[PDB]
Write a protein that binds this ligand. Structure first.
Ligand code: HEM
Ligand SMILES: Nc1ccccc1C(=O)C[C@H](N)C(=O)O
Length: 370
């Protein structure tokens, strides 16, 4: 069904918090990364784990939790305290089950958005709503890392986007039914929800401190693709013989922007030399069912062409409201990357800026006007 929820969208609805007692040894380490890292006992605990079979993970929610658990342990093992003391070999007894589970779930054996954000959360009270005050994350890395604020605000933007995502079938049906008003309603509804998502994005400032993000959390989200600290990638002991590179790119692995890029025929899949290659690569790091969803949307008739073919200024204005909301979102995201990467980096990206500025202006160049 593309694993897309009416309420939470690309987020994993109501994730599992507990594994079977079989996996308690995994569970304990993941639940205690702040103390084990700080006290310098983490790597020993990982290095003294026994081989635990994944055959006792009986369903998707259990596999997603195990993947989040092993991904957090792996990031902590590789990066340690976060200050250059690195491990380049992931011990056999983590690496083999982590890589087996990853293959089953068709995701790379590294921490991704779909683990640390889409699966990493709970309601404090199951009867209060999906708001920040009623929610928590399941795992953090270090005390003060602001992982609660970063993951939960990302999740809440994701949940806000769900309201626009569930309208997408109405769009294609209305094109196909030849239902002009239904299509116009739907596009205005999508834009309205995307605007609401932009409002939710503002909570980022209330809960994430630029020093903590840039200097702590960013470290544990860092990968080994093009990383000088791990120039040949990571050795997954006992599974592949030579090291492999995978990006640690959690923020950029949301499907939300690409979801509406593709819906509105904005051309970034194919296009820019280095911008389109980056956007296509980050798809490798999305759950397969979401990869599938983005592809099926590309195969559908073009909404942008349909609107263009109609000589209908009302349609063109609803379409442009969607494109505007997507520009607003990337423009605000530009501001945040300035606040949370660029300024702290200088207090010690021009390629990073150019990538984001490019995707925004390509989105901006898509407005119809006429
Ligand atoms: C909170 C919700 C967020 C969402 C939904 C989101 C979404 C995205 C998306 C879709 C991209 C791909 C570029 C594009 O499509 O325009 C991207 C890139 C990026 N975002 Fe975010 N983002 C969020 C928050 C953040 C935050 C708080 C930071 C803090 C610095 C950040 C840092 C980055 C970086 C560095 C990139 C470039 C890819 C990379 O090098 O990792 N993002 N983001
Ligand atoms: N801060 C942590 C550090 C390490 C492991 C878990 C956490 C949590 O966030 C626990 C959360 N209160 C929960 O409801 O599971």
């Amino acid at each position: 069904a593309y694993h897309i929820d009416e309420e939470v969208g690309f987020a994993l609805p109501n994730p599992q918090e507990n594994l079977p007692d079989f996996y308690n040894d995994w569970m304990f380490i993941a639940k205690h990364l702040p103390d084990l890292i700080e006290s310098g006992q983490l790597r020993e605990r990982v290095e003294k784990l026994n081989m635990l079979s994944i055959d006792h993970l009986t369903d998707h929610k259990s596999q997603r939790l195990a993947r989040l658990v092993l991904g957090c342990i792996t990031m902590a093992y590789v990066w340690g305290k976060g200050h250059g003391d690195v491990r380049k070999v992931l011990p056999r007894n983590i690496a083999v089950p982590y890589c087996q589970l990853s293959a089953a779930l068709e995701l790379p054996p590294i921490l991704v958005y779909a683990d640390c954000v889409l699966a990493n959360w709970k309601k404090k009270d199951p009867n209060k709503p999906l708001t920040y005050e009623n929610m928590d994350v399941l795992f953090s890395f270090r005390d003060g890392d602001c992982s609660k604020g970063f993951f939960l605000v990302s999740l809440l933007v994701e949940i806000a986007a769900a309201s626009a995502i569930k309208v997408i079938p109405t769009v294609f049906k209305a094109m196909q039914m030849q239902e002009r008003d239904t299509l116009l309603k739907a596009l205005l509804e999508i834009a309205s929800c995307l605007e609401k998502a932009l409002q939710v994005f503002h909570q980022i400032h209330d809960h994430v401190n630029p020093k903590a993000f840039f200097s702590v959390l960013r470290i544990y989200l860092s990968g080994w693709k093009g990383n000088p600290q791990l120039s040949d990638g990571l050795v997954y002991e006992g599974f592949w013989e030579d090291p492999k590179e995978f990006a640690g790119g959690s923020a950029g692995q949301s499907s939300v922007f690409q979801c509406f890029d593709v819906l509105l025929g904005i051309q970034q899949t194919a296009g820019g030399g280095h911008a389109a290659q980056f956007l296509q690569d980050m798809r490798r790091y999305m759950p397969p069912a979401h990869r599938n969803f983005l592809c099926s949307l590309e195969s559908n008739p073009s909404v942008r062409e349909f609107v263009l073919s109609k000589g209908d200024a009302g349609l063109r204005e609803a379409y442009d409201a969607c494109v505007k909301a997507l520009v607003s979102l990337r423009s605000y995201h530009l501001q945040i990357v300035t606040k949370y990467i660029l300024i702290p980096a200088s207090q010690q990206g021009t390629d990073l800026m150019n990538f984001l500025k490019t995707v925004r202006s390509t989105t901006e160049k898509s407005l119809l006007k006429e």
